[PDB]
Amino acid sequence: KKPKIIITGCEDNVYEKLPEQNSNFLDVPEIVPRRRSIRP
Amino acid sequence: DADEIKRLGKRFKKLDLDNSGSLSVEEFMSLPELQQNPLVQRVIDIFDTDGNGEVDFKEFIEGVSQFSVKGDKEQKLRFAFRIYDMDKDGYISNGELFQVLKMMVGNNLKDTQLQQIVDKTIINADKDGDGRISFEEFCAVVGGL
Amino acid sequence: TDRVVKAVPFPPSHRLTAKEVFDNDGKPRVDILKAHLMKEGRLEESVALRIITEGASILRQEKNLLDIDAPVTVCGAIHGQFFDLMKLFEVGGSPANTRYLFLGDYVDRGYFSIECVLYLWALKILYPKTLFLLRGNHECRHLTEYFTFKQECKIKYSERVYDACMDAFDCLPLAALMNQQFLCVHGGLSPEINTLDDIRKLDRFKEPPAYGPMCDILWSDPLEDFGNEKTQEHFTHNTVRGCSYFYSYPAVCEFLQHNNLLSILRAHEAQDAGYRMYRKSQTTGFPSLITIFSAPNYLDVYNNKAAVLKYENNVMNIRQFNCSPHPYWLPNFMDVFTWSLPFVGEKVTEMLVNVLN
Ligand SMILES: [Ca+2]
Ligand SMILES: [Ca+2]
Ligand SMILES: [Ca+2]
Ligand SMILES: [Ca+2]
Ligand SMILES: [Fe+3]
Numbered sequence: 001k002k003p004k005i006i007i008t009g010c011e012d013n014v015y016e017k018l019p020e021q022n023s024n025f026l027d028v029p030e031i032v033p034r035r036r037s038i039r040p
Numbered sequence: 041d042a043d044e045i046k047r048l049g050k051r052f053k054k055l056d057l058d059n060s061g062s063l064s065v066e067e068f069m070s071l072p073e074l075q076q077n078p079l080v081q082r083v084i085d086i087f088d089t090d091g092n093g094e095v096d097f098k099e100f101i102e103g104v105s106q107f108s109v110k111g112d113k114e115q116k117l118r119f120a121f122r123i124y125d126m127d128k129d130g131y132i133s134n135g136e137l138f139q140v141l142k143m144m145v146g147n148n149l150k151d152t153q154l155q156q157i158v159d160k161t162i163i164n165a166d167k168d169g170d171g172r173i174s175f176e177e178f179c180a181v182v183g184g185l
Numbered sequence: 186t187d188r189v190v191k192a193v194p195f196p197p198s199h200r201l202t203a204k205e206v207f208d209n210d211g212k213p214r215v216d217i218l219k220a221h222l223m224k225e226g227r228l229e230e231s232v233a234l235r236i237i238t239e240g241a242s243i244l245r246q247e248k249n250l251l252d253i254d255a256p257v258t259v260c261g262a263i264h265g266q267f268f269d270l271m272k273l274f275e276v277g278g279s280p281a282n283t284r285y286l287f288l289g290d291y292v293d294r295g296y297f298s299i300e301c302v303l304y305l306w307a308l309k310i311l312y313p314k315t316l317f318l319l320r321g322n323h324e325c326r327h328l329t330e331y332f333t334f335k336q337e338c339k340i341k342y343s344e345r346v347y348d349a350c351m352d353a354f355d356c357l358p359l360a361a362l363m364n365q366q367f368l369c370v371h372g373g374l375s376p377e378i379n380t381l382d383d384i385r386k387l388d389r390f391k392e393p394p395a396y397g398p399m400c401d402i403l404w405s406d407p408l409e410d411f412g413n414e415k416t417q418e419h420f421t422h423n424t425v426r427g428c429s430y431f432y433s434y435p436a437v438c439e440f441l442q443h444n445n446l447l448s449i450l451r452a453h454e455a456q457d458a459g460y461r462m463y464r465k466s467q468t469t470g471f472p473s474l475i476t477i478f479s480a481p482n483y484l485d486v487y488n489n490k491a492a493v494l495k496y497e498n499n500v501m502n503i504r505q506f507n508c509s510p511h512p513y514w515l516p517n518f519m520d521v522f523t524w525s526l527p528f529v530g531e532k533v534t535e536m537l538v539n540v541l542n
Pocket of ligand 2: 089090092093094095096099
């Protein structure tokens, strides 16, 4: 009596990549295993 | 201290390539250690107090003197405020903050991303609603939290 | 008259009042809220505290183990992605005519956590019987002061709003029993929870401790080789999280078979496709474990899809969706004066250092 499973997919994400920070200029700080989040 | 005036006169004299009593931007850029620097022009504009496009020896001393250890926190923040305030109207507008930041960031941020943080900075730091940040509004965020 | 770029919207400064948000019956107007929040518009601090308190009152009444019946949409971790939350409600169905069960992790990571809390708390007030919010590992006082949520409340609003959320997260239920078939938690199982009454006996109104079943409800994770185990150790130390346990495939199957359940819906772990159905249980025929992740393009670098689970008409429809454009923020909500002032002080100093020689 198990239910039916259906996947309704979509297209790939469309986002904007931050340009690489030239350390000579005023650069933006960086943000910080790849599956689970972060320990306390 | 008249000793410092005589000592800085020789250094001001070497920078004067045409010996005109004033220092142009191209005479400053003769220094190889000032090429890679986005705020050389802003300092030149702050030191200049007439609009001749040049810093004379009286403008040279008046500008350099604000950087000695003898100076309260208001002197240092006065010059820092004048970094963003381009037209020298006493306040920093949205464009003046976007323009100066555009020099320092180069191309590490796009125009659409630099403008967003500029507006939200003024929005959470404009205690009067005039659309600009004043010197007291500029000090309430710098130095401490 | 002095704005170079007009391609981005100038955020409004008018704080929404108590009359523009709440109607004459005490019902929050979510239409004015969504339109204002998406423009990065702030609310009045009295209104922001009012939405938190009236919502936490409804959350304090609810039980530790909620009874939810199909049809109901099951969401995963949001992680402060408010502009992706707007697409989640369009994929999973409007909340005015669709049941919702969130599995926690509404704050931290994404720089729109307070926008997510205010909007989900306003739907909880407007729909106190059809929308349900569970607790994650991030809805505590320890992680929010470490993952920029406290900074988000102090910059956008005030520290008093942060204190109200720490008292509202304590009211979030721990688990949910969906359609008398699935156990819906955040992290997973616990070595101290054999029956569903063990979930009911817990005092959720507190900060999640480092031990006990309440910590394992929000922090535990499945084994990396869930379903293909070397041993039969049901619960081993979760070495990735530093706390709680790793639950195995025999552990979940024994739990599903002991309480006569089908699967265990959870979040707490990121998935490349927004979902993951683990190994089928030999005594059920249905996936014994199902991870749901509702954050598309996690941390703006993962480039992952996010999926929602719409269980209706005996069909478990995992519906995926991609990300949406969101405004830019400097790390830790830093202004442009704090960011550029060191560069101003340094490069100007280098000038006179070489000018004066
Ligand atoms: Ca000259
Ligand atoms: Ca001059
Ligand atoms: Ca100005
Ligand atoms: Ca002002
Ligand atoms: Fe989590």
